[PDB]
Design a protein around this ligand. Sequence first.
Ligand SMILES: COc1ccccc1OCCN(C)C(=O)c1cc(=O)[nH]c2ccccc12
Ligand SMILES: COc1ccccc1OCCN(C)C(=O)c1cc(=O)[nH]c2ccccc12
Lengths: 304, 304
Amino acid sequence: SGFRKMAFPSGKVEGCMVQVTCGTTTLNGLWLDDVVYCPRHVICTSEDMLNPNYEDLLIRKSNHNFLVQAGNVQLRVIGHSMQNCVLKLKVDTANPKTPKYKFVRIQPGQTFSVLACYNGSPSGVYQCAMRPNFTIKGSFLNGSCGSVGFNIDYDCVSFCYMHHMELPTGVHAGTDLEGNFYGPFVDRQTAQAAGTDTTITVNVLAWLYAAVINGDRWFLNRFTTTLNDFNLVAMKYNYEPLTQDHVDILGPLSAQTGIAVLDMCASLKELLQNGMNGRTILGSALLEDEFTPFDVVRQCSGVT
Amino acid sequence: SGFRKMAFPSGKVEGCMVQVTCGTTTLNGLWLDDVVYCPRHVICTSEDMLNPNYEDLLIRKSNHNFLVQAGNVQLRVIGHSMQNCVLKLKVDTANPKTPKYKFVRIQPGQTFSVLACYNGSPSGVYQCAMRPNFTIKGSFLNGSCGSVGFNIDYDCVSFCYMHHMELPTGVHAGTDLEGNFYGPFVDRQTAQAAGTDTTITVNVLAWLYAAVINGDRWFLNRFTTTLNDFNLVAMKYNYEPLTQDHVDILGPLSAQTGIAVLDMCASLKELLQNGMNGRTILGSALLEDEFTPFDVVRQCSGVT
Ligand SMILES: COc1ccccc1OCCN(C)C(=O)c1cc(=O)[nH]c2ccccc12
Ligand SMILES: COc1ccccc1OCCN(C)C(=O)c1cc(=O)[nH]c2ccccc12
């Protein structure tokens, strides 16, 4: 028992991290097979970032301007191209540590692990949710761009995120591995509105199920509700409206605990309306939304 | 910016995990050089665990009874010995993935990363504190024994914990890598009192400094206190008494923010006496004690 904000083991991703330098700018790259992927803003200077013309900036660069180093060794760059907001540097050597991998575009509300890196060296790993407004609340400092987000299904790494920037509000934005930003964000130093965010209802319910499984049961009540009634409360408290698709995804946890999904919704309704009254659930004094129903089952079953 | 409960990258430790089976029991082992370390209770049956005589149980075992498998491949066991609560299985092959490593006995209040494993396969990584009462609040299921806790200083892995058991209260106990339990615990299925736990004061103060660095400042006040006055409040709220050694360890964070340690103690005193009033600090609605002052500086500087 016990329930922690657990990240995937980062080893398979650590073996793919490299440092990419272009001019005076250094960030991280992801080396998979004979390609290194990195944010295109590695080609910018401080002058450029207020409104960069990436096409023009990239035209001044040749393969030999992209310095790619895999720890101690230098990679030879034999091609470069820009795809959306990422650069793809073709190298003459396939990464011998390339795991089985896929590039996926995750949905808002899904979770993933981030391997924070600086100068191509991994520094730490943590678990994130992609917020409903397509930002992530990460931990990133100067030099962290190019750090990636991923999930692991046995031996296959699904890369879903590459870090690009910190908004003036202190939240983070980035792209899928094809360089498409999540959300409305652009890679320029401008004020950028992140939409109104909401709490990921299906994840809060999954975490209440994790709490019951792990013995924290004080919040269970004698009530039930309907999707309609619960959604009036979700609207008032800025929670995502719950749908039958969310109820269906919670099916396995409902079966495991014997607590019908709408009865758990009634517990969540009372917690939203009354608060925790100074109590905690799984070591938290707030309603946690960074665990999906798949995360809760994986953690509560023992998936390797 | 941003502040997350970050674990060390687990790659160096993933390369050391193996599965150890003795009879019908399977758990994890740690393969470093030509030795595999694992909990000695791998030699027990359900019958045995209420009061095992480990010396007698081990006498019935030969090298060939210890099945050690490193993923796909089988290791040949050429020696076995028990050291405190760990078994050391000498194998005929040194682990080619052995990182630079040390065995350390951590102090209560220090933090470390745990790589949770099942059947020798890593499943997830999370950051822990060793509680002042020598338990950890982990996430461990059947088959997780032998999972290890560690810290990483550049290329050196300091192993500090091997998981052995879950107390009836749902908290976790284990040993250093010489097999000495942290705390008063024994490896038998008996009710075992974990002492009165306390909140790690120096870590809460370090995390308040992390909050100020990352922009969460609402809790700063116009007050100051003394070590004596603050310790009366710490006593009332079951916090560890703060010492000058703790003040000295907070020196770098005090210098970085310009907030004197005793002024931060006055903010913590007001939070203890008044609560958070429904506000949050770094995404938490409670006072977090799982970040040491070294963790806060590492996370806020960019250490790889
Ligand atoms: C305004 O910046 C950008 C805007 C759009 C596109 C790229 C921009 O640059 C990114 C800035 N870089 C390079 C960082 O490594 C960075 C990333 C981060 O998440 N946090 C930071 C905090 C402090 C200093 C730097 C960072
Ligand atoms: C009462 O158990 C012990 C007592 C003293 C020494 C060893 C004992 O066994 C450990 C039990 N094992 C083997 C586990 O893998 C385990 C570890 C864990 O932290 N949580 C669990 C939750 C559910 C089922 C099992 C576990």
